[PDB]
Amino acid sequence: VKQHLQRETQLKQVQQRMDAQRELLKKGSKKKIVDSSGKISFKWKKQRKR
Amino acid sequence: IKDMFSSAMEVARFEGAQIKTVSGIRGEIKRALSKPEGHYRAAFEDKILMSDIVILRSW
Amino acid sequence: ADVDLHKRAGELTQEELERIVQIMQNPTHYKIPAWFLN
């Protein structure tokens, strides 16, 4: 059960990164936001979808 | 070629002789090298290998 | 020996020169490494 839990949390993280990449390549204006560490995020322009 | 002779006098005595490897590659001894004593320079039909033995058939 | 390594050898006080010659006389007990001297 513990290794089922480890497999599930690793799959959740890799699907989360995959979903962020897919969300990133759709469309709209965005900028690369960099934090203190280097964990980058993408902040999207306040503009609703036509 | 390393050790079939003990001295450059011996190689000088045997210059021009035809030798061959065990592969049948024919050859000829040409000149005694200077500093290692029984070592000489031979010329062969083509490139012999490091796993060969040369042969001077005498009687 | 604390003598400055840029002074010319003429202007040497005798305590500096005796410190130099004492160190060079007994190098082992001043723990000079044995590769400096042959």
């Binding site: 995959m18 990449q21 897919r22 390549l25 | - | -």
Partner: protein, 50 residues
């Protein structure tokens, strides 16, 4: 091959020297993928695969 290099004849036009190309050192680039595929795939293809 050395004799063919001596007798290249540099006014040698083929139609395949439009598609085929040459790297910096002068040798031949052979694309290791396909030649019935494409190495770079489009944005909507990447959207579907992702």
């Amino acid at each position: 091959l050395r004799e063919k290099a001596k007798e290249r004849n540099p006014d040698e036009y083929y139609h395949a020297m439009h598609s085929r190309k040459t790297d910096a050192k002068g040798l031949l680039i052979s694309s290791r993928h396909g030649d019935e595929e494409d190495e770079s795939l489009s944005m909507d293809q990447v959207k579907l695969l992702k």
